[PDB]
Scaffold this active site. Structure first.
Site, short mmCIF file in Angstrom:
data_model
loop_
_atom_site.label_atom_id
_atom_site.label_comp_id
_atom_site.label_asym_id
_atom_site.label_seq_id
_atom_site.Cartn_x
_atom_site.Cartn_y
_atom_site.Cartn_z
N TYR A 1 -6.95 -44.31 10.09
CA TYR A 1 -7.30 -44.45 8.68
C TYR A 1 -8.56 -43.65 8.33
O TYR A 1 -9.54 -43.65 9.08
CB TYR A 1 -7.53 -45.93 8.32
CG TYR A 1 -8.14 -46.09 6.93
CD1 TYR A 1 -7.37 -45.86 5.78
CD2 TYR A 1 -9.48 -46.44 6.77
CE1 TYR A 1 -7.92 -45.98 4.49
CE2 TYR A 1 -10.05 -46.58 5.48
CZ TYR A 1 -9.26 -46.35 4.35
OH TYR A 1 -9.79 -46.47 3.09
N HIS B 1 -24.48 -43.94 -0.99
CA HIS B 1 -23.07 -44.13 -1.35
C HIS B 1 -22.91 -44.01 -2.88
O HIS B 1 -22.63 -44.98 -3.60
CB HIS B 1 -22.61 -45.49 -0.84
CG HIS B 1 -21.13 -45.72 -0.94
ND1 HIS B 1 -20.60 -47.00 -0.96
CD2 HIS B 1 -20.08 -44.87 -0.96
CE1 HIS B 1 -19.28 -46.92 -1.05
NE2 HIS B 1 -18.94 -45.64 -1.04
N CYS C 1 -14.84 -49.92 -6.27
CA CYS C 1 -15.47 -50.58 -7.42
C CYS C 1 -15.86 -49.60 -8.53
O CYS C 1 -16.70 -49.94 -9.36
CB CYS C 1 -16.69 -51.40 -6.98
SG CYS C 1 -16.25 -52.79 -5.85
N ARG D 1 -4.29 -44.24 -0.75
CA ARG D 1 -5.25 -43.18 -1.01
C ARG D 1 -4.55 -41.87 -1.31
O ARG D 1 -3.43 -41.62 -0.84
CB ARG D 1 -6.19 -42.98 0.19
CG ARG D 1 -7.00 -44.18 0.58
CD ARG D 1 -8.29 -44.19 -0.20
NE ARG D 1 -9.04 -45.43 0.00
CZ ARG D 1 -10.30 -45.58 -0.38
NH1 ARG D 1 -10.96 -44.58 -0.95
NH2 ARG D 1 -10.90 -46.75 -0.19
N1 LIG Z 1 -11.01 -52.88 -14.74
C1 LIG Z 1 -11.53 -51.70 -14.30
N2 LIG Z 1 -11.03 -51.17 -13.16
C2 LIG Z 1 -11.55 -50.01 -12.68
C3 LIG Z 1 -12.63 -49.32 -13.40
N3 LIG Z 1 -12.92 -48.19 -12.72
C4 LIG Z 1 -12.11 -48.17 -11.64
N4 LIG Z 1 -11.28 -49.24 -11.63
C5 LIG Z 1 -10.24 -49.58 -10.64
O1 LIG Z 1 -10.86 -49.98 -9.42
C6 LIG Z 1 -10.18 -49.44 -8.29
C7 LIG Z 1 -11.16 -48.51 -7.58
O2 LIG Z 1 -11.61 -47.49 -8.46
P1 LIG Z 1 -12.31 -46.13 -7.92
O3 LIG Z 1 -12.83 -45.35 -9.10
O4 LIG Z 1 -11.39 -45.32 -7.06
O5 LIG Z 1 -13.49 -46.77 -7.07
P2 LIG Z 1 -14.29 -46.13 -5.85
O6 LIG Z 1 -13.54 -46.49 -4.59
O7 LIG Z 1 -15.67 -46.75 -5.90
O8 LIG Z 1 -14.27 -44.62 -5.95
C8 LIG Z 1 -8.98 -48.68 -8.84
O9 LIG Z 1 -7.83 -49.54 -8.78
C9 LIG Z 1 -9.35 -48.40 -10.29
O10 LIG Z 1 -8.22 -48.33 -11.18
C10 LIG Z 1 -13.12 -49.95 -14.64
O11 LIG Z 1 -14.04 -49.43 -15.31
N5 LIG Z 1 -12.54 -51.11 -15.01
MG LIG Z 2 -13.72 -43.39 -4.40
MN LIG Z 3 -16.97 -44.79 -0.44
#
Ligand SMILES: Nc1nc2c(ncn2[C@@H]2O[C@H](COP(=O)(O)OP(=O)(O)O)[C@@H](O)[C@H]2O)c(=O)[nH]1
Ligand SMILES: [Mg+2]
Ligand SMILES: [Mn+2]
Length: 615
Positions: free
Chosen positions: A216, A245, A269, A395
């Protein structure tokens, strides 16, 4: 000794000797040196297709793209199996798993002894940061997984150009990876080799990274979390810089002024979605551009500014939830040349994940899919059992240059000056939408004490609130309390130049209502919060002082194009005394656990918040 097949362009005797030693330990059948070319990437992908690890997607729907599905035990990071083996336990600290280095070496040596029998060792040379730049570091990852090799091509600057920078005497970060599944003569391989037993081990004094049992990306792409956060944060502590991060984005307002912000959210997140967000209705003339979505290296300059670079070359992003409303730049990015992992397969040879139905005719689910476990999936199955077609931590891997919003300075080794920091976790209660810290020390307090609900990005029970200081709980390379002091000391260095320090914000996209749904729409609408931060940076935005900092009033945000009332805003911005009293007690528990070297400034800030709550 086994023939290394060392290319002529490798001029580094110490490197070759280290490969020789690792080949003698791991005992692969053969050794292959990756040159990083496009031709090689196609050959390795075809190899993965022959092994059944990859399915090639329909060239008409998804050009030059592949789908891999993994063993259900190897879908996410394994934090309990991840170790910082510093010489002294106190330099790992309470947030890290520690083991005496000699004792860990005796644990891993029999595991790696013969781990690659029946397999090829791939020599993956890579640079974190632009090739040959003063801020870049070179690593060599030895892996028995071609999946790792092709993902490293996208996520790093990989291949033969590295050896021009290394030369005869350059140093490198040594990284060893095995899926932990040696093969006997004539034994049939599985499509996703792995081991139930996993270790991801870091030795800071030697910068060695050892990874066993997982294919992974978070556990096996060793330049990413293992080097560019865990090892790099220790180097930064010694040398006066930060490995964080954080996403890095540029934002330009209609007056043509451009600002850069860095945001630390925990895994899954919101970083990727924020880092390439599209300004919604009401923001004509604004633009947002992406420097990076995950890792930031930051150091101060004599002019009193903080300069950030993104050391990665691609995005390894969560797929579920992505569609043309939530993240159109990402949808366009993964139109082709992408590797997808653990999403679903359509009848026409395309990929699908939960969320894509919002772009579908009638917003309807597909009639039939093959899910990430190879099982038939239908909307009836989904309705009756809740089966996910795509794993919640599925992913995509895609090159940064596929992103239409990529900033022109995304690979500039001079970096971008950071005008504001943002910290925010997944919190169903308690934390308001956005708060500005009153001082650098108060901002460090907010980052040090932030909580967040666990996600599918690591194994374990999801949805549980935990402390995740600076979104670095899984990635801090040394004692967390010394890291707090590092941030406090950095602010003092910046202030001594006479500069105004970057502001620090807390955000929360994730407050839930009584039915468990999100009260704030988020995604592109987060532009409305970002625009307030820009106003504050310019000294033109108003705000009201409350217990934890300064927050906008309803009238301080631009609501053009979004039906969101003053009452809904009051819900996600009200400071609830009872909830913050409970939250401060959870901060006290953290401070008890982190008592060793805890900066006294954090207890002082906590005492002031307590007074403001009892006022
Ligand atoms: N409700 C909500 N969900 C979000 C938001 N931004 C991202 N997500 C969701 O949270 C998950 C992770 O988002 P991502 O942008 O890839 O987070 P990262 O892993 O921190 O890069 C995904 O399923 C997104 O659709 C937001 O502003 N509101
Ligand atoms: Mg990400
Ligand atoms: Mn990360």
């Amino acid at each position: 000794g086994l023939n290394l097949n060392t290319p002529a362009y490798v001029k580094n005797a110490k490197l070759i000797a280290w490969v020789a030693d690792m080949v003698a330990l791991c005992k692969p059948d053969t050794v292959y040196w990756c040159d990083g070319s496009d031709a090689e990437y196609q050959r390795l992908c075809q190899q993965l297709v022959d092994a059944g690890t990859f399915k090639k997607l329909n060239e008409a729907k998804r050009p030059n793209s592949y789908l891999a599905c993994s063993d259900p035990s190897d879908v996410a990071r394994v934090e309990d199996r991840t170790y910082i083996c510093s010489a002294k336990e106190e330099n790992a600290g309470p947030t890290n798993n520690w083991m005496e280095p000699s004792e860990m070496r005796a644990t891993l040596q029999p595991l790696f002894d013969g781990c690659m029998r029946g397999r090829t060792m791939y020599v993956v040379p890579f640079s974190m940061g632009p090739l040959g730049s003063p801020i870049a570091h070179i690593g060599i990852e030895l892996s028995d997984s071609p999946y790792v090799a092709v993902n490293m091509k996208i996520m790093t600057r990989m291949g033969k150009a590295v050896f021009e920078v290394l030369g005869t005497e350059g140093d490198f970060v040594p990284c060893v990876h095995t899926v932990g599944a040696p093969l006997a003569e004539g034994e049939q391989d599985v499509t996703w080799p792995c081991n139930k037993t996993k270790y991801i081990v870091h030795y800071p004094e030697t910068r060695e990274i050892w990874s066993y049992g997982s294919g992974y990306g978070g556990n096996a792409l060793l330049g990413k979390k293992c080097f560019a956060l865990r090892i790099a944060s220790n180097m930064g502590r010694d040398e006066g810089w930060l490995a964080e991060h954080m996403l890095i984005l540029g934002v330009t307002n209609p007056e043509g002024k451009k600002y850069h912000v860095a945001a630390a959210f925990p895994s899954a997140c919101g970083k990727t979605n924020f880092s390439m967000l599209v300004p919604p209705a009401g923001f004509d003339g604004w633009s947002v551009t992406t420097i990076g979505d995950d890792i930031a290296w930051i150091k101060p300059a004599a002019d009193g500014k903080l300069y950030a670079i993104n050391p990665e070359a691609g995005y390894f992003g969560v797929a579920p939830g992505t569609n043309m409303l939530t993240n159109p730049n990402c949808m366009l990015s993964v139109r082709g040349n992408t590797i997808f992992t653990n999403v679903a397969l359509t009848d026409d040879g395309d990929v699908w994940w939960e969320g894509m139905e919002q772009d579908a005719p009638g917003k309807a689910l597909p009639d039939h899919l093959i899910d990430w476990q190879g099982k038939d999936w239908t909307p009836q199955i989904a309705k009756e059992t809740g089966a996910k077609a795509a794993h919640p931590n599925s992913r995509f891997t895609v090159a940064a240059t596929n992103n239409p919003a990529l900033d022109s300075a995304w690979d500039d080794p001079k970096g971008v000056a950071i005008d504001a920091f943002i910290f925010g976790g997944r919190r169903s209660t308690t934390v308001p939408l956005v708060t500005e810290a009153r001082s650098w020390v108060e901002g460090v307090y907010m980052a040090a004490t932030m909580g967040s609900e666990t996600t599918a990005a690591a194994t374990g029970q999801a949805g549980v609130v935990r402390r995740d200081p600076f979104a670095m709980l899984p990635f801090m390379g040394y004692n967390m309390s010394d890291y707090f002091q590092h941030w406090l000391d950095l602010g003092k260095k910046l202030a001594a130049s006479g500069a105004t320090l970057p502001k620090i914000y807390t955000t929360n996209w994730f407050r839930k209502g009584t039915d468990g749904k999100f009260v704030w729409p988020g995604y592109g609408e987060n532009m409305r919060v970002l625009a307030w931060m820009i106003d504050r940076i310019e000294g033109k935005g108003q705000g009201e002082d409350h217990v934890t900092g300064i927050s906008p009033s309803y009238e301080d945000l631009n609501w053009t194009g979004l039906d969101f009332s003053a009452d809904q805003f009051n819900t996600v911005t009200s400071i609830d005394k009872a909830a913050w009293l409970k939250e401060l007690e959870l901060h006290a528990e953290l401070f008890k656990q982190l008592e060793h070297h805890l900066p006294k400034e954090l207890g002082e800030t906590k005492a002031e918040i307590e007074r403001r709550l009892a006022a």
